[PDB]
Structures are given as C-alpha cells and as structure tokens.
C-alpha cells in the first residue's frame with residue numbers, strides 16, 4: 001500500500017538529452033535517430049527577444065553556428081529546419097540509444113513526467129499535470145529550456161512536452177514535439193498571461209478512490225447525486241464540469257471499491273461545501289487533482305514497463 | 307522557479323535490477339559486478355515465515371535453486387552467501403552496466419529516491435525520507451521486495467535501502483545494502499510495530515526557506531527566539547529538537563535569503579501555535595518535512611549529475 005507522486009523511470013530519456021549551443025546561448029536538446037529537437041529561441045540574442053522574426057534569424061545562420069554536445073562527443077550538424085516553434089538539427093550520427101517512441105499532443109488534465117535538465121545533463125524527474133489553462137506548475141531554473149515531458153506505455157516513450165519559458169506568475173509554458181504551443185502563448189519575451197485555472201474534477205475523484213483503496217473512508221456518506229446537481233455545485237468552486245466520459249473512465253475504480261461514481265460525487269460535493277475540518281486524505285489537507293484515473297490504477301495495481 | 311518533490315534520474319539503477327526466483331517465490335534483486343543482492347526472505351515458504359531459521363533454510367539450498375533473470379538473459383548462480391538480512395548470489399556474468407557506486411547507511415531525516423520494481427522491471431520512481439522511527443512512507447505492492455533506494459552524488463550512485471516488508475500500519479521497513487535493518491525490525495512475518503514518529507524540524511525549516519525563495523513570505527515576522535525557547539515549544543508538538551549542527555547546515559539558505567535561522571524558527575513557532583488559517587505554503591496546507599536543506603539548495607540552484 002501507500003500513495004506517492006510517482007514519476008516514470010527516466011532511463012530511456014536520459015540517453016536522448018544533449019546540449020545545444022548557438023552563439024552565447026546554450027540549452028537542452030532531444031536526440032532521436034539523427035535529429036536533435038530544441039526550442040527555436042536558441043537562435044535569438046538579447047535584442048531579438050522582444051519581437052523576433054525567426055525566418056530572418058534562421059536564414060542568417062549556417063550549420064556551423066550550432067554546436068551540439070552529447071557528453072564529451074561533439075555532433076556534426078549537417079542541416080537544419082524549423083517546424084513551428086522547434087528547431088530540427090540534422091546530425092551525422094544516429095543516437096544508438098534511441099528508444100521506441102512517438103509524439104503525442106496531450107489534453108488538459110493528463111499527466112506526464114518531466115526530466116529537468118541543464119547543459120544536456122539530467123538533474124531530476126518529477127510528475128505533473130497539464131492544467132486546464134495550458135500551463136504546468138513545474139520546477140525549472142535558468143538553462144532548463146529543452147527539458148521534456150513524457151509518458152511510458154509498455155515499451156514506448158511518448159513525448160508530449162518540450163519546455164520553452166516561464167510566465168511571470170511562476171508557471172511554465174511549452175510545446176508538443178511538433179512545435180505547437182500548448183495554450184495561447186508565443187515564443188516572444190513579451191509579458192503574457194495564462195487564463196484562469198480550474199480544478200480537474202475527474203482527477204480529484206480518482207484520488208478520493210485511491211484514498212478509499214488505502215483505508216481512508218471518513219469522507220464517505222450514504223447520499224448520492226445526479227451529474228446535473230453535482231456540476232451546479234462544482235462550477236461555483238472553479239471545478240471542471242464532469243461528463244459521462246469521465247464517469248465511464250472512473251468505472252474500473254468504482255468496481256474495485258464498490259462505490260458508484262455518483263456516490264463519490266456526493267462525497268466530493270460535501271467536501272467542497274464543508275471543507276475538511278483539519279482532517280487529511282492520503283496525507284494531504286487539500287483536494288489533489290494531479291492524479292488521473294489511470295495513474296491511480298497503475299499505482300494501486302502495480303503495472304510495469306519494458 | 308517552482309518547487310516539486312523531485313526524485314533523482316533512475317537510469318543508472320534501472321540497469322541493475324533483476325528478477326530472483328527461489329521455488330515459488332519471486333522478488334527483485336540488485337546486480338552490481340558479479341553479485342546479486344536480494345532480501346534473504348526469498349528462501350522462505352508459507353510455513354517458515356512465522357519464525358524462520360535462515361541458517362538451516364540456506365544450508366538446504368543449492369545454487370540451482372536460485373533462478374536469476376536479467377530481462378530475457380538468465381544468469382548462472384555459481385555461489386551464495388548470507389550477510390545479515392540480505393542474500394548474495396554470485397553469478398557468472400558481471401553486469402556491464404554497473405555504475406560507479408557505494409553503500410551508505412543513512413540517518414533518519416535524510417532523503418533518497420526509490421525505484422519501485424516488480425519482476426525485475428522498474429515501474430516508477432519517487433522521493434521519500436527515512437522517518438525518525440526508521441520506517442518510510444512508501445508505495446509498494448506485492449512483489450516489490452528488493453526495490454532499492456538511492457541518491458546521486460556527481461557520478462556515484464549511493465545505495466542506502468533495500469525493501470523488505472510492509473508493517474500493519476501501512477508504512478515500510480527495510481535494510482541498508484549490507485543487510486542491517488533500519489530500526490528494531492526483523493525479517494519474520496510476526497506483527498511488529500514502529501515507534502511513534504516525529505516531525506523533522508530541520509527539514510520543515512529548509513522548506514520554509516524554499517517558500518521564501520519562491521515568493522511566499524506571509525508567515526514571516528520581525529521576532530526572533532533562542533534555540534532553547536524554540537525546542538521547548540517544538541517538543542510539545544512532536545518535533546525533533548533542533549541542534550547547533552542543524553543551524554549551521556541551514557547556513558547557505560539563510561545567507562541566500564538574508565533571514566537568520568533563529569528568525570525563521572520564530573516564524574515556525576508561530577505556525578505551530580496558530581496554525582495556517584486556511585493559507586498554504588508552496589501549495590501545501592501542511593508543514594512539509596521531506597525536503598532536506600540540501601534538497602532545497604539543489605532544486606533552488608540547479609545542480610546536475612554525470
């Protein structure tokens with residue numbers, strides 16, 4: 001038993017991280033096959049940041065302007081191209097450690113592991129969720145651009161995020177691996193603001209189920225409610241509305257514990273209106289929303305990867 | 307910026323995990339050089355558990371009774387010996403992925419990363435602390451015995467824990483890599499109880515400093531206190547007393563923020579006596595004690611490993 005904010009083993013990704021330098025700027029890159037992916041803002045200087053024209057900036061660059069380092073080994077950049085907000089540097093050597101992978105663009109509410117890097121060197125790994133406002137609450141210091149977020153399905157590493165910048169409020173914004181930003185953000189150093197964030201209802205529910213699985217039942221009751229009655233209350237507290245798709249997804253957890261989704265919703269309804277009264281659930285004094293129903297199953301059933 | 311419960315990259319450890327089978331029992335093992343380490347309780351059966359005589363049990367075993375699997379490859383056990391509570395299986399092949407490592411026995415209050423495994427396959431990684439009562443609040447399911455805890459210093463993996471069992475209260479107990487249990491526990495399936503747990507004062511302080519570094523200052527005040535006056539209060543709330551060694555260790559963080567340790571202690575004193583009043587620090591409604599002063603520096607300064 002037990003319940004921790006578990007990240008995926010980072011081994012397969014560690015071998016793909018490299019250092020990319022362009023002029024005075026150095027950040028991280030992702031080496032898969034013979035291509036290195038990194039944020040395109042690596043080609044900007046102090047003056048270009050406020051409002052860069054990446055097309056002009058890139059055309060004024062030659063392959064030799066890009067220094068790519070894989071530990072001690074230097075990679076030769078034999079070509080370069082831009083795909084949206086990421087730069088793709090063709091190198092002469094194919095990464096022999098390239099795992100089976102794919103690129104996926106995730107939806108808000110989904111979670112993934114982040115491998116924070118600096119100078120192409122992995123510093124740590126942590127779990128987090130894509131907030132409804134398309135930002136993530138990460139932990140990044142100067143030099144972390146290029147760090148990636150991923151998930152693991154059996155033997156395939158699914159990359160879903162590349163780190164680009166930090167917003168004034170301290171939250172982070174980035175893109176998928178095809179260079180499309182998550183959210184209404186652009187890679188310019190202009191002051192940008194994220195929309196208002198909401199709580200991920202379906203995740204809080206999955207977490208209450210984990211609590212029940214781990215012996216914490218104090219918040220349960222005999223009542224029930226309807227999807228309509230619940231949503232009315234949820235919206236008053238900045239919670240995402242709950243859909244029928246959410247209800248089905250929570251099925252496996254409902255079966256395992258024998259508590260119907262709508263029953264659990266009525267308990268959540270009470271928690272929102274009456275607070276926790278100095279009580280805790282799974283060691284927390286707040287309702288947690290960064291665990292998806294799948295994360296709960298995984299940790300309460302023990303699924304492994306190859 | 308940002309502050310997350312960061313674990314170390316697990317890559318170097320992933321390559322050392324193997325599956326160990328003895329009869330009907332299968333658990334995880336750690337393969338370093340030509341030796342595989344695993345809990346010695348892998349040689350017990352249903353009847354031996356209540357009160358096993360490991361000496362007799364081991365002498366009745368032959369090398370061929372131990373099946374060691376490294377993925378698809380089977381390892382030949384050419385010898386075996388017992389060192390306290392761990393079994394050491396000499397194999398014919400030396401792990402080519404053996405990293406630079408060492409074994410260290412940690413003190414309560416220190417943190418480390420746990421790589422949870424099942425059938426020799428890494429499932430996830432998470433950070434945790436050795437509680438003052440010699441248990442850890444982990445997340446382990448059946449088949450997790452043999453999973454290890456470690457830290458990373460530059461390029462050296464320091465192993466400090468091997469998972470052995472779960473206590474009735476849901477917390478976990480294990481040994482160092484030399485087989486000595488942490489705490490007054492023994493590898494028998496008899497009902498055992500951990501002593502009362504206390505809060506790690508020095509860690510809560512390091513965490514308040516992280517909060518200050520991240521813009522959360524609401525809990526600060528102008529007051530100060532003396533180590534003596536603080537401890538008097540701390541003990542009334544089940545907090546470890548604070549020593550002068552703790553004060554010096556917190557030095558780097560004090561300098562960086564410009565807030566004296568004893569000033570921070572007076573703020574903590576207030577928090578214990580007046581509660582947080584529905585406020586949060588770094589996203590938490592409770593005082594967190596699983597971040598050491600070193601973990602805070604690392605994450606608020608960005609140290610990497612090779």
Ligand SMILES: O=C(c1cc(=O)[nH]c(=O)[nH]1)N1CCN(c2ccc(Cl)c(Cl)c2)CC1
Pocket residue numbers: 041044049052140141142143144145164165166172186187188189307
């Ligand atoms: O390394 C960090 C960083 C990342 C982070 O998450 N937190 C933090 O403190 N620093 N930066 C800040 C963003 N910068 C940047 C340069 C040009 C453009 Cl055009 C844009 Cl959009 C951004 C690169 C360096």
Ligand SMILES: O=C(c1cc(=O)[nH]c(=O)[nH]1)N1CCN(c2ccc(Cl)c(Cl)c2)CC1
Pocket residue numbers: 001347350355358446447448449450451470471472478492493494495
């Ligand atoms: O795999 C788990 C396990 C670990 C955990 O942390 N949580 C959980 O639910 N299961 N076990 C429980 C402990 N068991 C055991 C056998 C013989 C002896 Cl002599 C002792 Cl001491 C222990 C081995 C299998």
